[PDB]
């Protein structure tokens, strides 16, 4: 226990220089300066920003593990989870088995949990992949800018065979969709606002030319229009994606290539493999809770000057609050972004699970063609840019270096003031 | 998680050191590390830093005169200092990046005048 001031500051020097800098406005606002600045380094910036690169990296590494394996996950059925005796229902913009497509054609068994995947829940499914591709694509925006848009998400699939209903649409007032050149209007509530989507249908028979099956099909298109792209409107469709496999937990069989790395247990259930699972969705809650904080740093704009008469750190010190939310808010947003990337960086992973991240989803299979391209060999591979993704959230770590410092400082005036500032 | 500098002591202007840190794998495993300093009469300063791959990045305050650098296989850290001034003078800290919460003792550098 120390009794007066004199001997616990000889002790820790630092904190001297801490009280002479927060009973001074120009070091004060110097501080409230920087907040702004890296304020505008995580939330304004992108590639710079190790809150945008994580929220990149969640989102990157929930559509992998679909490619990985989305095309070794089975599915069947008809509408409303029942069985089917005769129905191919193929899902468009899939990485599929050597294709494109994955074709959903398991007959008799009947869909759920270590069985195959309903065609109800792979479009659910299928619909927050194609949005994210989508987005991955076009490309993300900045963590403020929370009001942009895609412009148009498109995408469809097919339905054929005998008693094949999945491709039957039901409406908002009732009425069955005109099977044959029908068109109409979806709304849904995307993150906070109406989404239209465009529904459309569309028969081809067996003998109409380049019909490759030989058999007549039902085509749905579905084309949603000005569909929400902020982060924390994609990291609920990432939210979707992933705990739509882990909800239905479906069947897998991969077909195990020799001479590449090996997948562990060659078959089993999707939601099996726990630790990628977890790590996945971890990813995702801890990018949500970083997301968060952008609304409390835009909250506590620290630009206004404080300062008349000389400066008094008892009284004149409403501001310390606001400072202090906000360092403190930018502080937790670095530290959710580092701990997004230990999550998955295999740097620190161990067996079965270091060995899918290096192996598979780190790693993919085309030619390096832009985010969110879909192709004939994109199956097998994470193909979504996550080791990237993962050294460049370290890279834009390293040019935090600074700011970082500025944060704890600008935290740690603030919270002395609010100290002093009590009393009253 | 333990962080251990050394390597540091009194030199003349123009002079060189290496500094050593010496980190626990929790902190330095597939983390950023980086090199701080602390001057008397200031407050912790950043000085340099460097990924898991190995690329670095410098405050312009050091660039051209220091190099950092890492050794994956030992945990360790060093940063090679030349062309030393009287304001290189401080304490001298390693740390990941972002920062574990307890820092280390550091090790004292000085420059004088001859
Ligand atoms: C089951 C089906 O897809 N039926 C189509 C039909 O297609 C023919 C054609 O593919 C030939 C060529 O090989 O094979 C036929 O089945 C064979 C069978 O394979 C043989 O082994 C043996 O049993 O004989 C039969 C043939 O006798 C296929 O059936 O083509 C017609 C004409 O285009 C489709 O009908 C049109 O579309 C529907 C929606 C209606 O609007 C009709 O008026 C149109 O003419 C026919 O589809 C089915 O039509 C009936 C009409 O009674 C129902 O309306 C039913 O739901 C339709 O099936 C749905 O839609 C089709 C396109 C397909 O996607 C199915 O999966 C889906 O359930």
Known sequence: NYENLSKLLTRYSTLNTLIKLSADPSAINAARENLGASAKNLIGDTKNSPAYQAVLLAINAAVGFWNVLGYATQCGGNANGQESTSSTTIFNNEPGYRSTSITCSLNRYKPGYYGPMSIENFKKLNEAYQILQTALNKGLPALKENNGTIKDVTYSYICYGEGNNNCEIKLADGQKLQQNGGSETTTQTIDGKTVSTTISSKVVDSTAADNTYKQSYTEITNALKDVPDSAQALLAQASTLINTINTACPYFSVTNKSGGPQMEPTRGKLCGFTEEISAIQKMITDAQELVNQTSVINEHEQSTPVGGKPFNPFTDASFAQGMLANASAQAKMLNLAHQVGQTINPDNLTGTFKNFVTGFLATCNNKGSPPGTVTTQTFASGCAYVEQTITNLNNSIAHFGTQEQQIQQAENIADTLVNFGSHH | ?114
């Open chain 2, 1 to 114: 998680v333990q962080l251990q500098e050394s390597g540091g002591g009194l030199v003349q202007p123009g002079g060189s050191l290496r500094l050593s840190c010496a980190a626990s794998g929790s902190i330095f495993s597939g983390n950023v590390m980086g090199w701080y300093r602390q001057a008397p009469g200031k407050l912790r300063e950043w000085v340099a830093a460097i990924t898991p791959q190995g690329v670095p990045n410098y405050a312009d305050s050091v660039k051209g005169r220091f190099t950092i650098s890492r050794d994956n296989a030992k945990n360790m850290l060093y940063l090679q200092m030349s062309s030393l001034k009287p304001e290189d003078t401080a304490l001298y800290y390693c740390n990941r990046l972002p920062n574990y919460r307890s820092w280390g003792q550091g090790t004292q550098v000085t420059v004088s005048s001859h």
